Ligand binder design. Sequence first.
Ligand SMILES: Nc1nc2c(ncn2[C@@H]2O[C@H](COP(=O)(O)OP(=O)(O)O)[C@@H](O)[C@H]2O)c(=O)[nH]1
Length: 151
Amino acid sequence: KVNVLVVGLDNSGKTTIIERLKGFTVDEVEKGPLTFTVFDMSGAGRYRTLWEQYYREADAVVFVVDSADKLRMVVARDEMEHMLKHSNMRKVPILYFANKKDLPVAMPPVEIAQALGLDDIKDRPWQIVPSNGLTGEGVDKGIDWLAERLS
Ligand SMILES: Nc1nc2c(ncn2[C@@H]2O[C@H](COP(=O)(O)OP(=O)(O)O)[C@@H](O)[C@H]2O)c(=O)[nH]1
């Protein structure tokens, strides 16, 4: 099994995106040897310890961000940092979906990289792909980037 975590704050669009492909709550989506484990990083410390249990077997991460929500980008950055620093998270590829690129206030990848501090990630591959979860624009491109980097 190839395990891909699909994460981000609530309202980022992750359920909408993964639908295209096929207390604390998780959803599982199978696509052959790929298994997507999909969950929200909402609630801060309330459930964080639960979801960190999925890190050990993670082969890649899809981090979904609402491109148009600055406030939650603050919390998203924090949760991302917890993930990166966790001893069970291996140095596996991270695909960032800059989702809701259709919205007027959508931040472009350069702004998102700055907001999240992605340029400081130098120990594993990562890429930001703007996406529209409603039309599917960008989604296949992002998944293909990730799939070619599995090991
Ligand atoms: N405008 C716009 N809305 C989106 C996009 N992707 C998802 N949404 C909407 O954002 C809301 C939250 O989506 P959801 O998949 O439930 O996010 P989740 O909590 O991370 O799974 C839903 O109402 C979606 O219809 C997008 O690319 N553009």
